[PDB]
Design a binder for this molecule. Structure first.
Ligand code: 76H
Ligand code: ZN
Ligand code: ZN
Ligand code: ZN
Length: 237
């Protein structure tokens, strides 16, 4: 840590956070949420064989790589034949990676791995206010008017854009790299689409977590990229 760092639980205490933010030891306040909030409310089984007690004890994985739901990018429900053992309920169970929020040299705050993160594993859900096209139009205008530095929008599906500017979780801090170590994936949980960050390589402990952030934004000048990669393209857009 060339700058200060904090752990995800530090964001649960809003009085101590606002006091840490005063000292520059934590990022500016936002409303911490556990699940997406719709600004305007909107109007089955895999074939995995139930693991036995012995297989469970023996260390076998329930609803692993071959799970049909997993391949469909659908999380299992409580009715999964593997029930409580099911490893394919990661969003629902908040089975997030061990990550810290850190102050970077030039990009603001960021996320780093607090221990080694295996390749192709779940990091964090990207939570926020879900906007329709009209709300999105309005927020784009407001954030431009207010001269906000950072963007926190992520497209989810037609007529659904997540905005983590005001409400979100620590995933809002993920920075862009031209040579990233994470990607987004859109998963269906009880018929509703959600989006999360997943590693694309083994991320060693202490490394910043990054993705390809390609959200379009108007600006008098383009936004220069500070990712530091050999192949850095120079700009976020
Ligand atoms: C969907 C998740 C969006 N995350 C935010 C992170 C904000 C966080 N840094 C904060 O302090 O709250 C993105 C923003 O961080 C900045 N940023 C990200 N990577 C770069 C980069 N490589 N070069 C320069 N600027 C960058 C930039 O302003 C961008 O809009
Ligand atoms: Zn399964
Ligand atoms: Zn399952
Ligand atoms: Zn770059």
């Amino acid at each position: 840590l060339v700058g200060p760092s904090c752990v995800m639980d530090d964001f649960r205490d809003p009085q101590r956070w606002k006091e840490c933010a005063k000292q520059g030891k934590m990022p500016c306040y936002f409303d911490l949420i556990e699940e997406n909030v719709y600004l305007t409310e909107r109007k089955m089984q895999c074939e995995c064989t139930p693991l036995s007690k012995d297989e469970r004890a023996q260390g076998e994985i329930a609803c692993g790589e071959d799970c049909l739901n997993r391949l469909l990018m659908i999380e299992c429900s409580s009715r999964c034949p593997n029930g409580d053992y099911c490893s394919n309920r990661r969003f629902q169970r908040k089975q997030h990676a061990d990550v810290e929020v850190i102050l970077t040299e030039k990009k603001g705050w960021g996320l780093r791995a607090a221990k080694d993160l295996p390749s192709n594993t779940f990091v964090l859900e990207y939570c926020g206010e879900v906007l329709d096209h009209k709300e999105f139009k309005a927020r784009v205008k407001e954030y431009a008017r207010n001269k906000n530095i950072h963007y926190y929008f992520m497209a989810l599906k037609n007529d659904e854009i997540i905005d983590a500017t005001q409400k979100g979780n620590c995933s809002r801090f993920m920075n862009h790299s031209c040579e990233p170590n994470c990607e987004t994936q859109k998963w269906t949980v009880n018929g509703q689409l959600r989006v999360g960050f997943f590693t694309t390589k083994l991320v060693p402990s202490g490394s910043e977590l990054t993705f390809d952030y390609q959200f379009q934004r108007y600006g008098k000048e383009a936004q220069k990229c500070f990712c530091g990669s050999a192949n850095c393209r120079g700009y976020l857009g």
